[PDB]
Ligand SMILES: [Cl-]
């Protein structure tokens with residue numbers, strides 16, 4: 001199984017070949033022909049009366065390639081919802097242009113006995129490989145005095161009168177899910193370091209790595225000749241720092257910043273490096 005070490009204290013002897021592991025499968029470069037720039041939302045129901053199969057109720061895509069016959073007019077993100085049972089057409093509705101502002105709330109025009117169960121609002125990003133989901137509980141009651149809604153500490157719990165409409169809230173306004181976005185820049189990795197006992201925001205740049213293969217090194221020649229990252233880092237998502245040879249002056253805090261702003265990816269691997277001998 002895969003694990004993520006986000007911060008660690010490591011000791012290397014002076015003169016050794018130190019390796020500071022920085023890796024991520026989401027920082028792997030792929031060709032444009034494989035990019036599936038598509039966001040999908042779908043509501044699923046794990047019914048309590050059925051108690052077995054969890055069926056999909058309705059989904060909505062963000063992007064598509066408009067055609068007229070065999071002529072490909074182009075691709076532009078628009079949007080359209082699709083119910084999976086022809087009977088729910090007109091009964092289950094999502095907000096129009098849901099991906100414009102991140103409002104994916106499910107509207108049920110008139111709840112039925114078979115609508116009872118645990119709902120899930122699921123977001124899929126095929127380009128950024130993101131999966132987000134929230135749960136909503138729905139109970140159908142015949143007593144209107146019991147109809148209402150409350151937050152039980154983790155999810156919305158609905159109690160709807162039979163035949164009455166319901167709204168299952170699902171809102172995610174993060175830029176990766178909405179149509180708004182800054183122009184996508186290539187993936188970039190930043191290595192920096194600071195002496196022991198110094199806050200992170202006062203670190204000195206050590207090395208920049210861009211997905212196109214371009215790199216930028218900092219520091220005096222004595223430091224640059226001992227610090228490197230193996231070639232084709234973005235081909236395998238490995239940006240591990242190589243310090244060879246490691247010196248007692250290299251003792252300090254090292255940071256590996258992984259950036260893919262278009263996908264909301266901003267992670268940091270921290271290394272408190274100690275040098276013995
Ligand atoms: Cl076609």
Ligand SMILES: [Cl-]
Nearest residue numbers: 112113114162
């Ligand atoms: Cl019913």
Ligand SMILES: [Cl-]
Nearest residue numbers: 213232233234
């Ligand atoms: Cl590279």
